[PDB]
Amino acid sequence: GLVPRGSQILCVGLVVLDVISLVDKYPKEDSEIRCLSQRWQRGGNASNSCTVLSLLGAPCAFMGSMAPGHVADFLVADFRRRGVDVSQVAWQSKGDTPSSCCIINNSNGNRTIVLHDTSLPDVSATDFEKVDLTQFKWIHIEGRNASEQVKMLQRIDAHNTRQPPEQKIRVSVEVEKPREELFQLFGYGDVVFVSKDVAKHLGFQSAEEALRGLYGRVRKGAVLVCAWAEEGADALGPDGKLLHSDAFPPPRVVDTLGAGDTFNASVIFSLSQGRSVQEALRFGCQVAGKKCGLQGFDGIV
Amino acid sequence: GSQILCVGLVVLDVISLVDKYPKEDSEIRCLSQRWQRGGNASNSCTVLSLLGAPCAFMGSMAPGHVADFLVADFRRRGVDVSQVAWQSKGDTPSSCCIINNSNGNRTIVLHDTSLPDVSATDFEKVDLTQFKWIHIEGRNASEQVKMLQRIDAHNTRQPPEQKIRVSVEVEKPREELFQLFGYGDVVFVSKDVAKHLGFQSAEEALRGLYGRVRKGAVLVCAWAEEGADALGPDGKLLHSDAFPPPRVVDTLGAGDTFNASVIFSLSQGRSVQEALRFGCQVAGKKCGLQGFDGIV
Ligand SMILES: CSc1ccc(C[C@H](C)C(=O)O)cc1Nc1nc(N2CC[C@H](N(C)C)C2)cc(C(F)F)c1C#N
Ligand SMILES: CSc1ccc(C[C@H](C)C(=O)O)cc1Nc1nc(N2CC[C@H](N(C)C)C2)cc(C(F)F)c1C#N
Numbered sequence: 001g002l003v004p005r006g007s008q009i010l011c012v013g014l015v016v017l018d019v020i021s022l023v024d025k026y027p028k029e030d031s032e033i034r035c036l037s038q039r040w041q042r043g044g045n046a047s048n049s050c051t052v053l054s055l056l057g058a059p060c061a062f063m064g065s066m067a068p069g070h071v072a073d074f075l076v077a078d079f080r081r082r083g084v085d086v087s088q089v090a091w092q093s094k095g096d097t098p099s100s101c102c103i104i105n106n107s108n109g110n111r112t113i114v115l116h117d118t119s120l121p122d123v124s125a126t127d128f129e130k131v132d133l134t135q136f137k138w139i140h141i142e143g144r145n146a147s148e149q150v151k152m153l154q155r156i157d158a159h160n161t162r163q164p165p166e167q168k169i170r171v172s173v174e175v176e177k178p179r180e181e182l183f184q185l186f187g188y189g190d191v192v193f194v195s196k197d198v199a200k201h202l203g204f205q206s207a208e209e210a211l212r213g214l215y216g217r218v219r220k221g222a223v224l225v226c227a228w229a230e231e232g233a234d235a236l237g238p239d240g241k242l243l244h245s246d247a248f249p250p251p252r253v254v255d256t257l258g259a260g261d262t263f264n265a266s267v268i269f270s271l272s273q274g275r276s277v278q279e280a281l282r283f284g285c286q287v288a289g290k291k292c293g294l295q296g297f298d299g300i301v
Numbered sequence: 302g303s304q305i306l307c308v309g310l311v312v313l314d315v316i317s318l319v320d321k322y323p324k325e326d327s328e329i330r331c332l333s334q335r336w337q338r339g340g341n342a343s344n345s346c347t348v349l350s351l352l353g354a355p356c357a358f359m360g361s362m363a364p365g366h367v368a369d370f371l372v373a374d375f376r377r378r379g380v381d382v383s384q385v386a387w388q389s390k391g392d393t394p395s396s397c398c399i400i401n402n403s404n405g406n407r408t409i410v411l412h413d414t415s416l417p418d419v420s421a422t423d424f425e426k427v428d429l430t431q432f433k434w435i436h437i438e439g440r441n442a443s444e445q446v447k448m449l450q451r452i453d454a455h456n457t458r459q460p461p462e463q464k465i466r467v468s469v470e471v472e473k474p475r476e477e478l479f480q481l482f483g484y485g486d487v488v489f490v491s492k493d494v495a496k497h498l499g500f501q502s503a504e505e506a507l508r509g510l511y512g513r514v515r516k517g518a519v520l521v522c523a524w525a526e527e528g529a530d531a532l533g534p535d536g537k538l539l540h541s542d543a544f545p546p547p548r549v550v551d552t553l554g555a556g557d558t559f560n561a562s563v564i565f566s567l568s569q570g571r572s573v574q575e576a577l578r579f580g581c582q583v584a585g586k587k588c589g590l591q592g593f594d595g596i597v
Pocket of ligand 1: 196227228229230231232233247248249250253256259260261263284285288289290292
């Protein structure tokens with residue numbers, strides 16, 4: 001249907017079906033046990049961020065590879081259940097959409113994951129070149145196939161050079177997995193989200209150390225953001241002033257799966273509304289902190 | 302009197318085949334993954350249809366994506382689903398099964414969605430004339446005993462040729478299910494129930510539990526690689542060696558393949574010894590294959 005100009009937030013990245021089962025004790029091999037609870041939860045970083053952007057009230061769209069099948073049918077219906085637009089999905093003619101079986105032991109919180117990843121072709125620069133960029137106000141890219149994603153980012157920059165400052169598309173990039181191929185993406189985007197895992201892999205022990213050590217990698221003008229679980233989150237911009245927000249921990253922590261995605265989506269949402277980087281950091285910690293006290297994304301607003 | 306009805310459970314099995322069983326708190330990538338229709342009575346319908354027997358499934362299901370996959374899979378195998386007790390609310394049960402490719406072991410994490418089971422009221426609406434054999438998977442014994450009493454009432458006013466043969470499966474070691482031993486012409490008792498009651502072999506289990514079955518009944522007990530045994534009114538213990546595949550890859554549903562194959566062979570007029578051997582033959586072939594494709 002008709003999407004108004006410069007209204008949607010696009011998240012380019014991964015999607016996975018997690019069939020999560022909570023059990024009294026980890027099952028012994030060749031045995032049948034009944035789980036305490038079970039939920040089929042749609043995952044993936046860009047996918048979870050779309051869920052949160054929709055609940056926060058922002059029109060959003062997901063762009064990622066999916067192959068026709070039972071897993072894709074469940075995931076598409078789950079995207080629609082959360083009000084996410086899926087018209088940009090790169091549908092692959094062969095393969096399986098990723099899915100996993102996660103067993104969580106209630107006795108000690110241990111989590112055993114049996115992942116089924118058929119190495120499905122990622123979204124390419126050719127696929128992204130067919131996307132009409134006018135319907136988007138913000139494009140968030142989850143670091144995955146950096147060499148192709150750099151061409152996607154160069155296409156958005158070309159679009160912005162011939163647009164007034166009001167109609168320019170804001171860009172954010174997430175370097176979450178500690179893969180050396182992804183570190184070229186630091187030099188792209190207006191906002192760069194770096195994970196605690198990437199920071200620790202590169203020898204940084206805190207958000208302050210990570211932002212001071214990695215700011216030289218971002219392009220001129222960019223804001224580098226780093227969330228650090230119970231230690232809150234920090235941001236660093238061109239003025240060189242480190243910004244910080246304390247965490248807003250829930251009374252009881254029940255589920256941190258997707259807390260980083262809730263933080264990213266909430267920082268994007270607040271900045272796309274014209275709020276300052278300090279205000280967006282606080283909002284991101286506030287929404288991600290509330291999410292940690294809830295199972296899934298229901299009730300974050 | 303042409304169809305074989307299986308009353309029991311249907312679940313969606315999300316099966317992951319792995320090189321070795323994963324250690325707790327680890328992340329492993331499986332060799333392959335598939336959505337397969339499961340449940341004891343449901344798997345028996347799959348095998349009865351592949352063996353060439355008209356069959357029907359009776360079990361609780363709730364509308365949704367899981368039920369749509371399961372109904373399409375039942376129709377794909379030529380299984381009649383007009384007897385399904387459709388519930389207005391809930392989700393059809395589902396499970397995560399990890400199958401070790403090195404030895405065919407299967408670990409099941411079952412999610413029973415507390416969906417209402419098939420009741421004696423639901424079964425009372427079933428026209429029994431179109432069935433020649435009715436197999437009931439032990440689940441809600443108090444209600445299933447009323448279903449079994451209804452079939453007995455039907456048989457009392459039928460000539461011996463038009464009587465419906467009945468089989469019962471006591472698979473889970475639940476004390477409430479042991480009342481079902483005294484019902485049916487064939488009673489299938491699992492190795493788990495036998496070991497729970499202190500029996501160390503199929504011979505011990507059949508001698509120790511035959512007093513629980515009704516007069517005339519045949520008690521059957523499969524014992525994985527040790528074959529299977531049966532005991533009838535004549536008191537003669539019958540045995541069949543297993544037909545193990547050279548490489549065991551998937552034992553999920555081997556017991557269901559055994560039960561369906563023993564029912565199929567007996568419904569064709571074969572002896573209890575012939576049915577025991579056929580059950581071991583088809584279940585043994587299934588252990589060397591992923592799923593039920595290729596068992597015939
Ligand atoms: C600033 S919001 C944020 C942003 C990204 C992340 C995820 C990322 C992986 C990371 O930074 O670790 C997390 C959060 N936030 C929390 N994460 C938590 N954990 C994460 C795993 C830890 N284990 C299980 C010991 C616990 C606990 C809390 C707690 F205070 F309620 C909060 C909050 N509030
Ligand atoms: C007599 S046929 C039969 C009838 C009922 C069952 C019961 C079982 C619980 C099931 O339903 O899987 C199993 C079988 N048969 C086999 N089971 C095997 N298991 C290895 C360990 C597995 N554990 C207990 C789950 C089971 C291995 C083999 C091997 F020789 F190939 C065969 C055969 N033949």
